[PDB]
Amino acid sequence: QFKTVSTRTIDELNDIDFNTYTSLEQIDKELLTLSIGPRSKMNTLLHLDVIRKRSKPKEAPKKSEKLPFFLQLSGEKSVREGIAHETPEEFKVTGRLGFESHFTKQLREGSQSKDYSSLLATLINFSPAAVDLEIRSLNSFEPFDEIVWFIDALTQGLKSNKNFELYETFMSLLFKAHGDVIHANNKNQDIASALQNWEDVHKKEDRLDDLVKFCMGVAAFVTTA
Amino acid sequence: RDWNTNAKTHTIAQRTIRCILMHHNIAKLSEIPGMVKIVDAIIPYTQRHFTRVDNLVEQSYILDYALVEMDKLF
Amino acid sequence: RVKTELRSALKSTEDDLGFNVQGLKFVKQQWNLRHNYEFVDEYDQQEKESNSARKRVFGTVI
Amino acid sequence: KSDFKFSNLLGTVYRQGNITFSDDGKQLLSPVGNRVSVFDLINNKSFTFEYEHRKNIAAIDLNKQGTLLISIDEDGRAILVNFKARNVLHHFNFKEKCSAVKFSPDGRLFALASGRFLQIWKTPDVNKDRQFAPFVRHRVHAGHFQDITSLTWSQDSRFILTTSKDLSAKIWSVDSEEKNLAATTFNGHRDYVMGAFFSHDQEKIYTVSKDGAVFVWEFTKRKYSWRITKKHFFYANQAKVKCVTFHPATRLLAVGFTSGEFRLYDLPDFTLIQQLSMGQNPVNTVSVNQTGEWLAFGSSKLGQLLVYEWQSESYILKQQGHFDSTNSLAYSPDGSRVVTASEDGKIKVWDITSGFCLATFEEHTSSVTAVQFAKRGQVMFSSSLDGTVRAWDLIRYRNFRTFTGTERIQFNCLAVDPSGEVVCAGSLDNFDIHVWSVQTGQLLDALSGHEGPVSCLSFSQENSVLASASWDKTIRIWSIFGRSQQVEPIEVYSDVLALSMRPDGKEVAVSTLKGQISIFNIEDAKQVGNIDCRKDIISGRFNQDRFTAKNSERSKFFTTIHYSFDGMAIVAGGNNNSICLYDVPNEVLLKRFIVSRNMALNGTLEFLNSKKMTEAGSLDLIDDAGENSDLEDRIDNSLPGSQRGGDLSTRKMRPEVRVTSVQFSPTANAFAAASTEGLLIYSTNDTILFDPFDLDVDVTPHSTVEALREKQFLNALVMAFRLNEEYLINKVYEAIPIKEIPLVASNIPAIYLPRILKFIGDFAIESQHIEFNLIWIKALLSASGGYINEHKYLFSTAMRSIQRFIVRVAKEVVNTTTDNKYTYRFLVSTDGSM
Amino acid sequence: ESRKIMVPPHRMTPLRNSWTKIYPPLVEHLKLQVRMNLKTKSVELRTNPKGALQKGADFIKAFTLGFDLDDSIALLRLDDLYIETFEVKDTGDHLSRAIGRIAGKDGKTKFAIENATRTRIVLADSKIHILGGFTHIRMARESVVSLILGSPPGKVYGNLRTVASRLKERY
Amino acid sequence: YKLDVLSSVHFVPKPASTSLEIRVETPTISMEDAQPLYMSNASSLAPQEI
């Protein structure tokens, strides 16, 4: 009643002896598969501005004036696991080599090795405020490297058919945050080719579309008529 | 704008909006004085028509269901 | 044959419908980030948007 | 079928007691009346513990391993629960009203403030078996003179700092050797000491009192002997401190007053970080996250629960429930959320999995009597006592229609068309039925012919015939549509309350005041069969009444009944604490559920303790309200002959236990009951209860995985169906390859079709394999979608659960990828130049 | 073991008048010995016999850079605080009004980005120094680089609103 | 209010009031309660009201 006992015979497939089946992560590499996580993370990512605008109180709270400016940083010594309490590890771009963040360093290293698996693991790991705050700061100014590294990282991501609703919302957050600079230097060769191969992998997503169209139409017809 | 309020005369409006969008400069179209009280008028009507035509595509799969029954017939 | 041609016509019209939705809201949004206003404080921002919203008055029954 | 267990308790996010967070503060534990609800705030879900105190609970703590909970009620009956197994480990009766219980930070001891004794016990293991006496007493200290109001452990589990109604606070070492380090008492407050905390380094001690002073105590010299170094005051004049907490690591003192206002301070400098208000009722509980980022506040009068992050000034949730005042419920046409019509005048739309309210609607100026969905979850109708029926769009959240009569009556029940052209409503003072069009707003008709108040209305869902039933002992069937104006009155033995209608519209089941549920054929107006239910009803004895529960005529009948969606069962509830469900072919009781064991509600006990009956009256009708510490609950503002008004303070009796509405879930094998404690949700689950279907000796989990390893996939699937074991069905289902989904789905036998459909529904709502589940749905609907259409009511809850998966996760994903495709085509196909 | 921090002759008189609140945390909280060379216009920090010399060097180097007294004490305490220096370098056209774009009328854009990103910025002619946490410096620097490289005021102010919210948010 | 509660809310309602309501446009996300989820992301004004 408090633990689970093994239904394995005494005398004188450990999941099947403990009556469980831990559902495997994806059944086939040619099958779309959502994230192992809450379903609401997509909606939180897609509309977290209007959700927080809802969540604000109706009038401003009464603070003091002789309040310390670095109140968020002036803790003591249960440790904070946010993007604000992040320290750098171990000659002027937006993030030097001593002041690179973990996301920007892994994005650059994946651009070297042409394998963004650790980048995508960090993206699927951290929280929606951290995701918005990392995508919103992506060096959209002179040569456009960090944008195109993010785009072909998402390409390598949704080639793998896992976490794909999150890779779709990361692309939506990219187009929302600074799709205006992509529209600005449209016909730039690197960013146009990165969007080209993203569309090359992304155009095979209508399998889900006509699959849910069939299921919706025939389910409605069978239930009503 | 006022052709898009029909569900009948809306396709002509969408083709004309599309050719304006793909033949003009988007910064010019935004900074023309008066082009937000029009495009805010006709974003929700295009969304209404997208919902309606998408549901037409959704209920277009009774043909596919009837075809799979007609192939199960032997 | 009817299924293929009919669904091709319907997806052909909703293609430009979706194109026009995303293009027109891009136009409106780039006009907004060009010259909407300057409020960083969320309370003054939400009161500014409530004063600049679209109002319509309705006849209710109590 | 009949094996329902108590799943959930919607409504009532907080009643009385202290909020607790987890250690990794993802879930918060909230004392609802005698249950405990746990809301997981990140994985958006929620559950309620099955166990049940016999009075309202007053203290909660679980250790920071997360492994066991202890809950104490308002006369000291503790219950120790295994938090992961969700089963109760021990029942331990402390003899008097315990104000606080706390586990140590190192988990191994707990202490509690029982009266004026601080008693420390040591925690039993979760790995050990249950003993006869698992708690072993460490000590019991008595140094306070009046009751202890609070505990606080130190960071190392070495000292404990307690605060009393007696105007002091004391520090006690846990073990005897450090008795000299902790022997001081902290005087100086004018009122009750509400809190006493350490600093992070355990050098300063902050003691906060009820009048509004916080004292900083330091081990200084004026030898070294715990001076008071600074007194800070809140200067809230009329209000006074109701709850205090302190996060020592972030130096954050959070204080809630009796005026709804809470202030939060950075303590040793005493700088007001923030000050804002929950409302007008007092803040009964403040609790803080382990990282100190979230603050959960509870007010007990309106039953409301905030958790609020004070850095980003924003509410994680700001919820409020309804105790005792809930008139109706209605499931959404997919069983994802429940709409609650409540007596304080409002509609509340509660998500079922995450136990929270999404939208609330206050446009009725009186008690809302009925809610009902229509147009497949797009519109929702409600009728209230202020004279109005009104309609609610659940897209744009607008009351777009309001229907009144011409006679100024108050409406008690409604019924909408299937093809929602017409709404219909009946009153308890008018004898007519009011028929409104929904498209225009006008009063289409007033049907007349009852000679008694129309108690219940329902439209048949298939042939659209109206069935009303009234207290003139008569059910009546109106053919409204198409030139008929036909009336068929069926008489019945006694006066009717709660008619209900079959999903195919063939039959109607009425509940009568005799205590029976009669079932009639509509087209040939003759009785098909009845259930005699007044002898399997648990009618408790009230405290005030002078007649036994056997001879009472208060609640031996059902005021709300509802059909199952296969048409084969009836759930039923009334003004009694039993809800009963039956199968209408055999007219026999499947199962009876005791809806409350709270002795704080009235009609729970059938036999009242004769010790409490004295030489002049019972001892529970004596009002001990002037023995209270303050005026706002010494006040009696209960006008005398009030029953079922509003504002529980204005009725002077205990809240009776009653179920006001029952409904079955349209998608998954459950029912919701609107009791006084909340929306009780009872559901089966297939993980437990081995219930096979024609297995033989050669049908075995071993045999199924041999057939799976030998890849007879259809034989493995039907072996797992004959086992009816959820893990085996899931294992075989995931092991079948995509190449031969349609061969297996075409060769599934027709008796295993509702099992695989309801499995795919309850699996695919939360499973990640979206294309796999849609491939299976497409193969099943294509291969056997004619059998479903000719056996509609068998797959009426398994197909509604499937299109709860297609439109609610799969269509949202498809919407996102569609918007990405179109934004790509715009962003690369057009001209961005300057 | 010692350090020398050269005080420029535009932050010399505030150092002398607020010197009496600078050396006490340098000589009793930190246990250094401190001299002020009036000949080289420098501050010398030597270690007595009875890893804090770099803390004192950053304290007086923040004051040297242009951050005020309480801001420098905030750098001396508060271990999670850093400070990033950069010139503009990205003349009438570009140098003489990119810094006017960082400032704005009465410095309101600089005040807004300070409050939004929870850093604080001292803006010289073309030398921008930023005192904040690591992520805070990242966001304030990204916005400063943004409005020297050309972005609309609506875009940078909307990003400032958003970054204030998401930096204060748990999850 | 107290006559209704004393009368045990069997009363006779207020006669009639054709009042006048102004609704601004806003997302129905923002017209909701504070919880992690949402139910509908429409705008409170119809296309024929814009």
Residue in F with minimal Cα distance to C55: F24
Distance between CA atoms of residues D194 and D166, nearest Å:
11
Closest Cα to residue E45, out of E55, E131, E85, E77? E55
Distance between CA atoms of residues D508 and D518, nearest Å:
8
Helix (H) or strand (E) holding D232: strand D227-233
| Pairing outcome for strands D433-437 and D422-427 | antiparallel
What's the CA angle centered on E45, arms E44 and E48, to 5 degrees? 135
The answer to whether residue D293 neighbours chain E at the CB level (below 8 Å) is yes
Tokens describing residue D253: 């003192």
- Chains touching chain F through at least 3 C-beta pairs below 8 angstroms are A, B, C, D
Resolution rounded to one decimal, in angstroms: 4.1
Pairwise CB contact (< 8 Å): A133 & E163: yes
Distance between CA atoms of residues D678 and D355, nearest Å:
12
Instruction: Let me know if A143 is exposed, middle or buried by CB neighbors in 10 A (0-12, 13-18, 19+).
Output: exposed
Mutant choice from C30, C31, C33 vs E, greatest count of E C-beta within 10 A:
C33
Phi–psi pair at D207, nearest 5 degrees: -125, 115
Pairwise CB contact (< 8 Å): C42 & A53: yes
Question: How far apart are the CA of F46 and the nearest CA of chain B, in angstroms?
Answer: 8
Tokens describing residue E135: 């992520």
Q: At what angle do helices E95-103 and E108-117 cross, to 10 degrees?
A: 60
- Chains touching chain A through at least 3 C-beta pairs below 8 angstroms are B, C, D, E, F
Distance between CA atoms of residues D654 and D648, nearest Å:
9
Which DSSP string corresponds to chain A?
--S----------HHHHTT-----S-S-TTS-B--SS-TTHHHHHHTHHHHHHHHS-SS-----SS--TTTTT--------SSSS-PPP---SSS-SSS--HHHHHHHHHHHHT--HHHHHHHHHS-HHHHHHHHS-S--SSS--HHHHHHHHHHHHHTTTBSHHHHHHHHHHHHHHHHHHHHHTTT-HHHHHHHHHHHHHHGGGHHHHHHHHHHHHHHHHHHH-
- What residues are paired with D253 via a beta bridge? D246, D265
Closest Cα to residue C61, out of D345, D410, D407, F16? F16
Distance between CA atoms of residues D207 and F28, nearest Å:
45
List, in order, residues 6 or more apart from D806 with CB less than 8 Å away.
A212, A215, A216, A219, D774, D777
The answer to whether residue D399 neighbours chain C at the CB level (below 8 Å) is yes
What's the CA angle centered on D484, arms D480 and D486, to 5 degrees? 70
CB D785 within 8 A of CB A138: no
Mutant choice from D397, D398, D823 vs C, greatest count of C C-beta within 10 A:
D823
Pairwise CB contact (< 8 Å): F42 & D386: no
Pairwise CB contact (< 8 Å): C60 & F45: no
The number of C-beta contacts closer than 8 angstroms across A and B is: 25
CB D65 within 8 A of CB D71: no
Single-letter residue type at D632: E
Count CB neighbours of E128 within 10 A: 22
Question: How far apart are the CA of A106 and the nearest CA of chain D, in angstroms?
Answer: 25
Pairwise CB contact (< 8 Å): D311 & E171: no
* Radius of gyration for chain E, computed over Cα atoms and rounded to the nearest angstrom: 18
Distance between CA atoms of residues D571 and D1, nearest Å:
13
Question: How far apart are the CA of A91 and the nearest CA of chain D, in angstroms?
Answer: 31
Distance between CA atoms of residues D41 and D22, nearest Å:
11
Distance between CA atoms of residues D465 and D324, nearest Å:
34
What's the CA angle centered on D773, arms D768 and D778, to 5 degrees? 155
Single-letter residue type at D211: D
Distance between CA atoms of residues E139 and E119, nearest Å:
9
Preceding-residue numbers of gaps in chain E (C–N over 2.5 Å): 50, 90
Residue in D354, D367, D410 closest to F37 by CB? D354
Is it the case that chain D and chain A have 3 or more CB pairs lying under 8 Å apart? yes
Tokens describing residue D376: 């497949």
Q: How far is CA F9 from CA D366, D557, F1, F12, in A?
A: 9, 23, 10, 9
Count CB neighbours of B13 within 10 A: 20
Tokens describing residue A107: 């994005």
The answer to whether residue C33 neighbours chain E at the CB level (below 8 Å) is yes
Question: How far apart are the CA of D799 and the nearest CA of chain C, in angstroms?
Answer: 26
Distance between CA atoms of residues D828 and A182, nearest Å:
8
Single-letter residue type at D417: D
Pairwise CB contact (< 8 Å): D831 & B25: yes
Question: How far apart are the CA of B69 and the nearest CA of chain D, in angstroms?
Answer: 7
Residue in E112, E152, E155 closest to C40 by CB? E112
- Chains touching chain B through at least 3 C-beta pairs below 8 angstroms are A, C, D, F
Chain E 137-166, CB below 8 Å of chain D: which residues? 165
List, in order, residues 6 or more apart from D127 with CB less than 8 Å away.
none
Count CB neighbours of D702 within 10 A: 9
CB D383 within 8 A of CB D411: yes
The answer to whether residue C57 neighbours chain F at the CB level (below 8 Å) is yes
Tokens describing residue D654: 């205990």
Q: Which residues of B touch D834 (CB under 8 A)?
A: 25, 27
Residue in F14, F32, F36 closest to D41 by CB? F36
The answer to whether residue F50 neighbours chain B at the CB level (below 8 Å) is yes
Distance between CA atoms of residues E33 and E31, nearest Å:
7
CB D453 within 8 A of CB D431: yes
Q: Which residues of F touch D395 (CB under 8 A)?
A: 28, 40, 42
Pairwise CB contact (< 8 Å): C60 & F19: yes
Tokens describing residue A106: 């892994």
Pairwise CB contact (< 8 Å): C23 & D818: no
CB A220 within 8 A of CB D376: no
Question: How far apart are the CA of B66 and the nearest CA of chain A, in angstroms?
Answer: 10
The answer to whether residue B36 neighbours chain C at the CB level (below 8 Å) is yes
Q: Which residues of A touch C14 (CB under 8 A)?
A: none
Tokens describing residue E18: 């607020």
Distance between CA atoms of residues D311 and E97, nearest Å:
35
HEC per residue, C26-43: HHHHHHHHHHCCCCCCHH
Q: With b meaning 16 or more CB within 10 Å and e meaning fewer, what string describes D717-748?
A: bbbbbbbbbbbbbbbbbbbbeeeebbebbeeb
Count CB neighbours of D419 within 10 A: 11
| Pairing outcome for strands D304-309 and D261-266 | unpaired
Helix (H) or strand (E) holding D316: strand D314-320
CB D155 within 8 A of CB D142: no
Q: Return the residue matching tokens 């000292």.
A: D159
Q: Return the residue matching tokens 């937000």.
A: B36
- Chains touching chain C through at least 3 C-beta pairs below 8 angstroms are A, B, D, E, F
Q: Which residues of A touch B58 (CB under 8 A)?
A: 213, 216-217
The answer to whether residue D312 neighbours chain E at the CB level (below 8 Å) is yes
Q: How far is CA D295 from CA D19, D39, D181, D290, in A?
A: 10, 15, 33, 10
Distance between CA atoms of residues D159 and D149, nearest Å:
17
- The SS3 call for residue D566 is coil
A207: left (phi over 0), alpha (psi -120 to 50) or beta: alpha
Phi–psi pair at D103, nearest 5 degrees: -80, 155
Q: Return the residue matching tokens 């005192």.
A: E131
Q: Which residues of C touch D389 (CB under 8 A)?
A: none
Single-letter residue type at D741: I
CB E63 within 8 A of CB E75: no
